[PDB]
């Protein structure tokens, strides 16, 4: 009955734990320049 309600709180915790793990591992793509016109910057 009310067993379920507080267990519905440990949801959004893990939602955010999904979310930060989802996000910043993408953003890792420190030199990316291989030519003269590349290495201008």
């Amino acid at each position: 009955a009310m067993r379920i309600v507080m267990g519905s709180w440990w949801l959004f915790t893990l939602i955010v734990c999904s979310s930060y793990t989802a996000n910043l591992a993408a953003f890792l793509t420190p030199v990316r320049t291989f030519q003269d016109l590349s290495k201008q910057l």
């Binding site: 009310m2 309600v5 507080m6 709180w9 959004f12 915790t13 955010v16 930060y20």
Partner: peptide
Amino acid sequence: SFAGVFCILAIGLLLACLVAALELWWNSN
């Protein structure tokens, strides 16, 4: 970003307060 943990935790303890306030009052009932 990283201190949302306790922002969920203390609200969960707030959810832990109401059913205890009704349970020990039912023991008083």
